[PDB]
Amino acid sequence: RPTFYRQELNKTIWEVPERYQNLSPVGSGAYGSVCAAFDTKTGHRVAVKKLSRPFQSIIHAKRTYRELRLLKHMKHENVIGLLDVFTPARSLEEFNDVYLVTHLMGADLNNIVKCQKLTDDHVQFLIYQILRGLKYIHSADIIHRDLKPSNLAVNEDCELKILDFGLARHTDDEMTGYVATRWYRAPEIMLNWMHYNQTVDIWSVGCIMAELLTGRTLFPGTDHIDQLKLILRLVGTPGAELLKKISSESARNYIQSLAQMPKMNFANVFIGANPLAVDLLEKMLVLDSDKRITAAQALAHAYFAQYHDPDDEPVADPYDQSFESRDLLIDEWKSLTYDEVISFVPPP
Ligand SMILES: Cc1noc2c1[C@@H](O)[C@@]13CNC[C@@H]1C[C@@H]2N3C
Ligand SMILES: [Cl-]
Ligand SMILES: [Cl-]
Ligand SMILES: [Cl-]
Ligand SMILES: [Cl-]
Ligand SMILES: [Cl-]
Ligand SMILES: [Mg+2]
Numbered sequence: 001r002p003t004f005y006r007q008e009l010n011k012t013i014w015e016v017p018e019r020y021q022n023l024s025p026v027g028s029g030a031y032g033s034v035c036a037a038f039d040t041k042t043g044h045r046v047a048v049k050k051l052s053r054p055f056q057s058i059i060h061a062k063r064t065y066r067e068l069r070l071l072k073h074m075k076h077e078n079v080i081g082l083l084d085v086f087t088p089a090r091s092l093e094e095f096n097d098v099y100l101v102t103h104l105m106g107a108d109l110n111n112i113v114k115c116q117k118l119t120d121d122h123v124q125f126l127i128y129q130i131l132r133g134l135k136y137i138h139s140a141d142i143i144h145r146d147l148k149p150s151n152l153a154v155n156e157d158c159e160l161k162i163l164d165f166g167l168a169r170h171t172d173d174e175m176t177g178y179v180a181t182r183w184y185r186a187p188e189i190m191l192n193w194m195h196y197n198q199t200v201d202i203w204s205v206g207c208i209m210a211e212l213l214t215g216r217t218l219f220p221g222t223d224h225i226d227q228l229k230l231i232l233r234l235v236g237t238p239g240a241e242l243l244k245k246i247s248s249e250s251a252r253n254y255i256q257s258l259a260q261m262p263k264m265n266f267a268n269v270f271i272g273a274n275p276l277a278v279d280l281l282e283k284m285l286v287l288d289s290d291k292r293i294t295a296a297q298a299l300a301h302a303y304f305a306q307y308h309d310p311d312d313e314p315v316a317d318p319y320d321q322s323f324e325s326r327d328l329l330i331d332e333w334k335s336l337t338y339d340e341v342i343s344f345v346p347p348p
Helices: 058-073 109-115 120-139 199-214 224-235 240-245 249-257 275-284 295-299 330-342
Strands: 004-008 013-017 020-028 032-039 045-051 084-086 099-103 152-154 160-162
Touching (some): 013 020, 013 045, 020 045, 058 084, 084 330, 120 160, 120 295, 199 275, 199 295, 240 249, 275 295
Antiparallel strands (some): 004 013, 020 032, 084 099, 152 160
16 A cells, blocks of 8 residues: 545645646536646556545435546557546445546647647648547447547647546536537437437537638537538438337427428538548538448548558457346445556556
8 A cells, every 4th residue: 555645626635646746727617626746656647536435425426436437447559548546535324425537638729720720731640639539439339428529538749548438427507508518419419319329429529620720610500400501401311211210209290390302412511521530520421320421431431541450459358247237235346446546457
């Protein structure tokens, strides 16, 4: 067991191993508080996240277990990994606090799209890396569910990492009105049309790629219905085949109220873009999720000829998510979480 030291940082007691020095507050969601620190064992600048009220309800206890299982599994160059996890508790009986340690991220894709001029070459390399990371995530039957520019961190070398997996339901309030939290979501999840699957992440990659090419949000809706009208004007209204797959009867009735519209010419929307970029956008931004290109298929598209190497695009170890359908008490979720904290082995 390492030695721990205590300090108060913005009304919060932090108790951390001595290896972690120069703690400085960076942020706080409602899931926890984050400090930047210097890790003296590795020489990395790190983010240390202290979870807030990790075991306060069955829903919160299970979310804590879900987040730790997911971060422990992810071992890929284009995905955030877990550097460390610790608790100052010396037994299960006194276990209350969980701390997670990752690489400290500088810029996100939002910073570079807003404030920098991107060549077609830059767009090929950035989208290539998102798809390499998604081939790995999807091979484990994991869905990210929240891909957007603020969840895609990049370093000076142009090396991209996916972070901030969707691990809890968003609040109705967070998805309401003129907000980036909804602009990247597939229409089947935004309007609860049907059981969704990993195809929702490829819709989000199409939206991000379009914004790198134009410098503008593709579907900046003022609310759910405005955003659906923006989407159907580009891709066309649904045919009989997709309407049959909308399990929601009222959602089907509303769609049929709208005047029919054909798919637009994407060469006339993305004026001057590489024709191979236009072709790949037409294969991602398909309204029927069964017909979208997959991450593995997209990696072999001619747009990525400069970067594609089928011997250096790895898949994940199998991932057991049977816990997701299990009904347990708070103390059972807390015991499962304690076992995952004490069994952690750091990367090489
Ligand atoms: C950080 C950062 N800020 O500006 C840049 C970066 C790098 O990620 C990048 C690599 N390729 C796209 C980016 C544009 C520019 N640089 C050439
Ligand atoms: Cl230490
Ligand atoms: Cl990492
Ligand atoms: Cl504790
Ligand atoms: Cl964003
Ligand atoms: Cl597993
Ligand atoms: Mg985020």
